[PDB]
Amino acid sequence: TAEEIRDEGNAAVKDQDYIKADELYTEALQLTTDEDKALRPVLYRNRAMARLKRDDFEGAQSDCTKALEFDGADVKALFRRSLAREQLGNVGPAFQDAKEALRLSPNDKGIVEVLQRLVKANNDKIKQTTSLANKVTDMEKLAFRGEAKDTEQKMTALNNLLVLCRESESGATGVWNQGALVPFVLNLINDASENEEVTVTAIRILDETIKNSVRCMKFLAMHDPDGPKSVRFVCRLMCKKSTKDFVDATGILVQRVFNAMAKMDRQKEMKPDPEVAEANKIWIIRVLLELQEMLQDPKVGAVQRETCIDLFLKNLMHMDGGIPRGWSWKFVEERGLLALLDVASQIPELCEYPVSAETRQHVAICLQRLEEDMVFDTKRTIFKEKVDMFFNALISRCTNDDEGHKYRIKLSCFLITMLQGPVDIGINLITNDQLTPIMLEMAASQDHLMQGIAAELIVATVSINMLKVGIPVLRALYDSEDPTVKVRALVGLCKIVISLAKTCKKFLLETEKYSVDIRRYACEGLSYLDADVKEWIVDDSLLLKALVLLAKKAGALCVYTLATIYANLSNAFEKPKHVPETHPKDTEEYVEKRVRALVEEGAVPACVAVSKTESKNALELIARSLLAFAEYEDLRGRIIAEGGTVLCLRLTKEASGEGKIKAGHAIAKLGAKADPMISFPGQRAYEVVKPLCDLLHPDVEGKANYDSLLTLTNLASVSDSIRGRILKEKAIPKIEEFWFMTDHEHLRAAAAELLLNLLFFEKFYEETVAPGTDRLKLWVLYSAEVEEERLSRASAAGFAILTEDENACARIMDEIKSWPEVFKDIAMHEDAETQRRGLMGIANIMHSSNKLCSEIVSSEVFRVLVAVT
């Protein structure tokens, strides 16, 4: 069974991509270093060569040293350890790694190329390294020591230091200062009167340096002589200042500690290594019992607590990307899950430790996906029965009579949350006969909380028998004099004549009484209305203005609300596979008027504001809304005017299954036709590179193909470095699609400027390589006429350019009846560009040699006589 999977890795390296191949060997190591001592080391050589193929040098070095461990006969292990130590920055070990491999096999040019680059590398490396130490020391003296100009010189000095670590791994080694950046950084966050931009840039340098492994792991060890106290401080670093963005960026230093102890995706799709996890399990129990223990700590703050909850969903779901199985269940088997339930009960009114209203999202989702990482067999049941025994622990203890009302609101708020996350167990609990009467008992009490949450409970239940109970109580509670209960109940009318909307308009149009959660439910109800309400909303201006202002005004829970607000009015979501035709609200020009007013009222800043949630399906909805804003007369300027694309690519990195593709086609429709230094200026042009890739991954059949071509048509019009960035992702399979299937497409004129310009090393090796004969032939056949003005010119320009090559002029003598049709369709045809485009193409064809100069004779003369007049 060992060999039967060992073959599949190397086959997977060459079948399509190595991105899938690297994990195959990683699965194949499960019986290694036990059942056999022959297969395990060589599979370690192949796996380390596999991650070396990607961009992971740390694991490749620590597996190449694992396979050298048996005898050191592996030569590819030495070439790989030296290739890793080359990019590692420490080229000294790479050189002695490579001299001991080239001495074993004197042949093979690559072993020589490594030593060739290493000679100059070690040669200059001491000079550049002492210059890097004077730059590191001059930088530390400026940003954090006695320096002038107050904020201005410091906030810039570190700003150069972050790039001194960020774009150079060798400079990343020198900014960390062998283990000295940390005390300076944490000494900065300790200043209560420090500008927070300085604090966030400092930590940003901090996580950058520890991105690797040991530099991060020493960041745990250095703080206390004994380990558990030393991981506490790293965890408890968010409990230092907590300004606004300080907590989000002090969170990633803790996130980075997960990436070290088990090696993880960081962003791009890479699986953790069990081999490191089992070694570092001691660290992971220590940090996760520390995050669990600080999850209920009263001293722990509001937002830093829910960022502490973000770390769990992002790390312990082994069916997504995190600690492997057996640790996902170590969390449920003890207090880790029972205590995890408790925080979902607490609400901004009843808590005991600070809790935010936003907590909702962060507490729903990590339970829901905990149902996704419990997709074993005894997992489903141990999870459910832990929740059922907690629910039984709460009903028997609530005694909603003698000041036990707090227990009844606690169980109610615990149940309202799980209808937002794990519905499979949440409806499983509202089966109980004790539930409905207690719900009713809160419904009529003078305790204003119990009634509000009461209407919130059944509006959460909106997807069987308890459902018919709660609706009548909802409408009888709608009349309530208090806004919290009327606004909390109006959602449930929409959740089942548009009479309610005339009150929904005044609910948010008057920004006086309603502010915090009051406006929030006022929008949530608005989201549940659809069908023809669209135009009735569009013909009011204060509706869009007040919805945008409400989303700008702390729209943290305004997520799915706005995302379904602008999506349903115009946008359409595709689904797997009479009434609409008569609709004058979402079908014809009214769909254009809806986005036309929606954008000019200012929906974009509300979108970038409410996108900060990790809600995958709300990410898909905001992506669909964003592409729906695009493809209109002046909308192309409107997207960039606030930053639609800049967060569109931000949502491409993490979205739902179709959310990445909706984001990708969204960026394509958004730009393209604007300008090359507008659709991705400066440092952002490279970020737009990746989304264009995997946009040809499916098939060239729908409207998603033509946009994917048209945006790349302008992606390479400026600067060569971008054209060389495109080559490293290999666009060849993509162009192969429209080479032999698309009929009505301008993509040929883009492929011309692609193959012609680009990097010299690539495009010279691409215009020539592979059977290009039919490519040259279609370069001539379509340049004749073909009822198109541009095809005849852009097709001809590559004829005039390629004619200049020496190897290329032998192959032109394969087709001769193609030249009468292009030489005639230049003087006789009515087009203007094709005449100058064709005459210059003919002259270079008659200037290469005399063998073809007589084969045409008259086809050229028909143009030469026409030119003189």
Residue numbers in the entry: 7 to 469, 475 to 507, 525 to 557, 560 to 607, 622 to 913
What does the paper say about this structure?
While extensive crystallization trials of the UCS domain containing various KR mutations were not successful, we succeeded in crystallizing the wild-type UNC-45 protein in a crystal form, capturing the UCS domain in a distinct state. The corresponding structure of UNC-45717 (the number reflects the shortened crystallographic c-axis, when compared to the previously reported form, UNC-4581511) was determined at 3.8 Å resolution and exhibited a similar domain organization as UNC-45815: the chaperone adopts a V-shaped structure with the myosin-binding UCS domain opposing the core region constituted by the TPR, central, and neck domains. Like UNC-45815, the UNC-45717 molecule formed protein filaments in the crystal lattice using the same 4-helix interface to connect molecules. However, a pronounced structural change was seen in the UCS domain, a right-handed superhelix that was bent to different degrees reflecting two distinct conformational states. Structural alignment of the two states revealed a bipartite organization of the UCS domain. Its N-terminal (ARM repeats 10–12) and C-terminal (ARM repeats 14–17) halves are connected by the irregular ARM repeat 13, the hinge of the domain. The disrupted interfaces between ARM repeats 12/13 and 13/14 appear to provide the conformational flexibility to allow for a 15° rotation of the C-terminal portion, a gross rearrangement resulting in a 10 Å shift of the C-terminal ARM repeat. Although the N-terminal UCS half is held in position by the underlying central domain, B-factor values increase abruptly from ARM repeat 14, the first segment of the C-terminal UCS subdomain. Together, the crystallographic data underline the structural flexibility of the UCS domain, which can adopt discrete conformations. Strikingly, mapping the KRcanyon mutations on the structure showed that the corresponding lysine residues cluster in a well-defined region of the UCS domain, contributing directly to the interface of the N-terminal and C-terminal subdomains.
